[PDB]
């Protein structure tokens, strides 16, 4: 799939203290490369990838500044929205934003995006053409009118089309060894026989870099996905992922089943049996 640079903002109101807490994480594809946390003492934007550590104080001074400004503005956004919903000061609330650019095949923007959510409900999205907003309710209509009066949809469109893509291309270069190399899954089958219930065959894939993978089980030249248990792809915590698929088969039939693995880091689709 095409490369992506994405930023994820979370604000939480803290009414015990009458203040807020603010997080950002930056991603290129499935690699976190920066964070910020407004509760950190002398809070700054910190690298979370080796290949970004090299950036000078000039880079960190700008991101840290944006982060602090956003921590301040996002405090009052939470107050604003609480007013729009005529809500108590009792409760905690969350305001999320995400935005980013995909890198098209002719080195231009392919699909830029930008969206917000109050208490996990869609509030506003920038439209596909990036020249207009869609608002989910009466409160969101207030925010949308202000953004329209401020011509902010063209500011986002210029950013997504300009800086976002450009810095995606720079990051992809800086981290090409990790970011552009596909690690194929290390795979095996495990067998767990039971009292009197059938044998469980588990097909493991571990240490693959791009998150996207397909596991399936087949018997004699027919798919079996129908009754197979498939866990959600999970981080290994070293930047790779893992996944397994399991099914129960009659005692003695274990070699009648093959696991099929599809991942973009393999030369050919792969076939496993216990």
């Amino acid at each position: 799939g095409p490369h992506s640079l994405s930023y994820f903002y979370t604000a939480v109101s803290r009414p015990d203290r009458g203040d807020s807490r603010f997080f950002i994480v930056g991603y290129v594809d499935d690699t976190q490369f920066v964070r910020f946390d407004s509760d950190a003492p002398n809070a700054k934007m910190e690298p979370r990838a080796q290949w970004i550590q090299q950036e000078g104080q000039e880079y960190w001074d700008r991101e840290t500044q944006i982060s602090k400004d956003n921590a301040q503005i996002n405090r009052v956004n939470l107050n604003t929205l609480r007013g729009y919903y005529n809500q108590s000061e009792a409760g905690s609330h969350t305001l999320q934003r995400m935005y980013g650019c995909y890198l098209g095949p002719d080195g231009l923007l392919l699909r830029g995006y930008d969206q917000d959510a109050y208490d996990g409900a869609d509030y506003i999205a920038l439209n596909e053409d990036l020249r207009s907003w869609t608002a989910a309710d009466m409160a969101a209509q207030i925010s949308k009118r202000k953004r329209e009066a401020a011509d902010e949809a063209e500011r986002m469109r210029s950013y997504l089309q300009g800086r976002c893509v450009e810095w995606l291309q720079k990051y992809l270069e800086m981290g090409k060894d990790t970011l552009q190399r596909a690690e194929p899954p290390k795979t095996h089958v495990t067998r767990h026989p039971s009292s009197d219930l059938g044998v469980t065959l588990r097909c493991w894939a571990l240490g693959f870099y791009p998150k996207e993978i397909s596991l399936s089980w087949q018997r004699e030249g027919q798919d079996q996905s129908q009754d197979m248990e498939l866990v959600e792809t999970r981080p290994s915590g070293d930047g790779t992922f893992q996944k397994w698929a399991a099914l129960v088969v009659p005692p003695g039939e274990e070699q009648s089943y093959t696991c099929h693995v599809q991942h973009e880091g393999l030369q050919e689709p792969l076939t496993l049996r216990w």
């Binding site: 996990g120 588990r202 959600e232 290994s236």
Partner: protein, 96 residues
């Protein structure tokens, strides 16, 4: 309001007496306030927690992890407290 799904697993396949990493992957939850305990033999361990991030559906995920050396006696598990759960979710760890 959305409940977390919880997965508990090692980074590499477990060999006894071999240094490894114990993961508790907690996902799909809203709101973000959550308690995630890696327990050894019932007692909380000092487990490092990943930065708060979220998926395209707005749901939050976190990876809690810590070094560990598997063996035949230690029982490990992951405990999760969330407003969406009436009593804590515990998932036992088991080379699966």
């Amino acid at each position: 309001a959305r409940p977390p799904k919880v997965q508990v697993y090692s980074r590499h396949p477990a060999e006894n007496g071999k240094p490894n990493y114990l993961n508790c992957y907690v996902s799909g939850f809203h709101p973000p306030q959550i308690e995630i305990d890696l327990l050894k033999n019932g007692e909380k361990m000092n487990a490092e927690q990943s930065d708060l991030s979220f998926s395209k559906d707005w749901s939050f995920y976190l990876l809690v992890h810590t070094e560990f050396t598997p063996n035949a006696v230690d029982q490990y598990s992951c405990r999760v407290k969330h407003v969406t759960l009436d009593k804590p979710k515990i998932v036992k760890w088991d080379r699966d």
